[PDB]
Every structure is written in C-alpha cells, then in structure tokens.
Ligand binder design. Structure first.
Ligand SMILES: Cn1nc(-c2ccccc2)cc1NS(=O)(=O)O
Ligand SMILES: [Cl-]
Ligand SMILES: [Cl-]
Ligand SMILES: [Cl-]
Ligand SMILES: [Cl-]
Ligand SMILES: [Cl-]
Ligand SMILES: [Mg+2]
Length: 297
C-alpha cells in the first residue's frame, strides 16, 4: 500500500535504491528504426529512442519515423503518446502524428529554452495573425485563443488538413515551471494542472491518445503519465490499496525507455497519487484547495 511504503522508504532513506532497482528491472527492447542512419536528424538525443514495437509510425510514404511511443495501458484503459520536443525539421511530422492519431490534446511539460539551450522547437504559433503552414505534411496551424495562468497556459489551436480542408481543434496545456530533472513546485500545483487536462475532455477514449512531451519525452513526461494512470486505476476500482505504483511504472517502461528520470520524480509521483486519491475517493473540495495553493492567477 502506497502511503505506508512511502513512509518506510522515506524513513530508511532509500529512494535512490528503490529507483535504481526500477532502472535495473526495466525492459530493454530494440530501437533499430530510430538508429537507422537516415533517422539521425530526427532524434534530439542519441540515447533516447522509441522501441520499435511501440513507435508511432507516420503515414508517409517516404520515411515513417518519428521519435514517439504509444504507451498503451491495458488495465487502466488509457493510452498516451510520449515524444521528444520536436526539432526544427520534425515539427511537420509532429502535427502529422497528432492528425493521423486523432489526438485532441498535447501536454507540453518543458520550455523552449531551458538552462540556456534550445530544448524544443517553437512548433506552435504564438500569435493569432501568424499561422504556421507545414508544407511537407500539408497542414496549417492557427492559434485561436490562449488562457495564461501564473505557471501554465492553455491554448486553443486549429489544425487543418490542407489536402481535405478538414479542421480540428487541438488543446495545448503548457506547464512552464517544471524544471528539467526536477519536480513540480507542489503536489497541488501538479494536480491542479492534471485535472485541467482531464477537464478538457482530451483524455476521453473517444479521442486518439493525448500527446505528452517534455524535451526528451521521458522524465517529466513519465512523471505525468504515471500519476495519471495510477489515479485512473484507483478510480476504476474505487480502491487506493489496489494500486502498485512501481509496477505501473515498470509496465509503462515496456513502451518507452527511461520514464521518470530521478528518484525525486518517483518520490514526487507517490506524493501526487497519495494526494490525488483524496479527490478520487469522494472529497471534491480538495480540487478548489489545489487551485488556491497553486496560485494560478
Ligand atoms: C533533457 N533530458 N535529457 C534526458 C536524457 C536521458 C538519458 C540520455 C539522454 C537524455 C532526459 C531529459 N529530459 S526530460 O525527459 O525532458 O525531463
Ligand atoms: Cl516556452
Ligand atoms: Cl535559460
Ligand atoms: Cl530545437
Ligand atoms: Cl529547467
Ligand atoms: Cl532511466
Ligand atoms: Mg496579438
């Protein structure tokens, strides 16, 4: 049971050891496509690749490769697409994947510039009047509106298939204050953001899998999906005791390497799930309290 286990690990000071055992137990599957010489410029990080079995295939034609994985959580019945922050030459492929996979929401957990370096291309338009046209993949993208909060922004985008003239609405949830190899400021601030995402309808099974990315699409991304999946699992069952967090994380790591990148992100995951279980188990009031504690205005 997660809270008792939490207290025990904390007491004995063993988060590093718990987290290293997850790393040693994690699946190791090939990534031969990601490593094809022709794909080298499609990859942000040498050592972060999608497994071949789980990779998202683009429906071109010339090169179906994108660094994106489908994390398909069978028992939870939710999927997520985890991807690296798009590169200057992969922004058209990224929107192509969103279109082909029928995603309604993209959760971005990083900034474009972190620590002085460019960790993600500016893949969405920051002004209504300056849309983006991705000529390679025949798509256009328009900022429709944005809602700017203290630590996150929600943007409404319109994606258009230029070939068919079909248009879809895409919600962009942008967490701007989650440091790389770091944790959110509090469980409240993380949960307030997660439930904004849930509220939008973007995780509905009527839509394709939500796209989640940070820079490498593994540490901040894995932290997000983990907490969400664990909360979903206990909601299904109405039973917090039935959720084994480390097991869920190991199941996720069958689909993408390196999910959750520090011991403290693991520890933060347990805090978020333990705190969010209050909501799942019937205390609707805590939602209002997370909003306050998050200082979103
Ligand atoms: C910036 N970065 N770099 C990694 C990583 C891990 C192993 C090898 C190379 C990069 C993960 C991450 N970031 S995160 O996934 O964006 O939080
Ligand atoms: Cl940014
Ligand atoms: Cl900086
Ligand atoms: Cl970039
Ligand atoms: Cl950072
Ligand atoms: Cl790892
Ligand atoms: Mg303006």
């Amino acid at each position: 049971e997660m809270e008792k286990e939490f207290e025990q690990i904390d007491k004995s000071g063993s988060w590093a050891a718990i987290y290293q055992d997850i790393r040693h137990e994690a699946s190791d599957f090939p990534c031969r496509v990601a490593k094809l010489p022709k794909n080298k410029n499609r990859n942000r990080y040498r050592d972060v690749s999608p497994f071949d079995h789980s990779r998202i295939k683009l429906h071109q034609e010339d090169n179906d490769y994108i660094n994106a994985s489908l994390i398909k959580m069978e028992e939870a019945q939710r999927s997520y697409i985890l991807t690296q922050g798009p590169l200057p030459n992969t922004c058209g492929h990224f929107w192509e994947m969103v279109w082909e996979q029928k995603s309604r929401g993209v959760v971005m957990l990083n900034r474009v510039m972190e620590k002085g370096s460019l960790k993600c291309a500016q893949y969405w338009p920051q002004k209504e009047e300056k849309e983006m046209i991705f000529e390679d993949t025949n798509l256009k993208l328009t900022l429709i509106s944005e809602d700017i909060k203290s630590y996150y922004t929600v943007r409404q985008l319109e994606l258009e298939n230029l070939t068919t003239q079909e248009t879809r609405e895409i919600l962009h949830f942008h967490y701007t204050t989650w440091p790389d190899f770091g944790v959110p400021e509090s469980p409240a601030s993380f949960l307030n953001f997660l439930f904004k995402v849930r509220e939008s309808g973007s995780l509905s099974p009527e839509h394709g899998p939500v796209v989640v990315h940070c820079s490498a699409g593994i540490g901040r991304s894995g932290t997000f999906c983990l907490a969400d999946t664990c909360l979903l699992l206990m909601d299904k069952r109405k039973d917090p005791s039935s959720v084994d967090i480390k097991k869920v994380l190991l199941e996720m790591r069958k689909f993408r390497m390196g999910l959750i990148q520090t011991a403290d992100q693991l520890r933060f995951s347990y805090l978020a799930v333990i705190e969010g279980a209050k909501f799942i188990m019937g205390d609707s009031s805590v939602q209002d309290q997370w909003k306050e504690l998050s200082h979103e205005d």
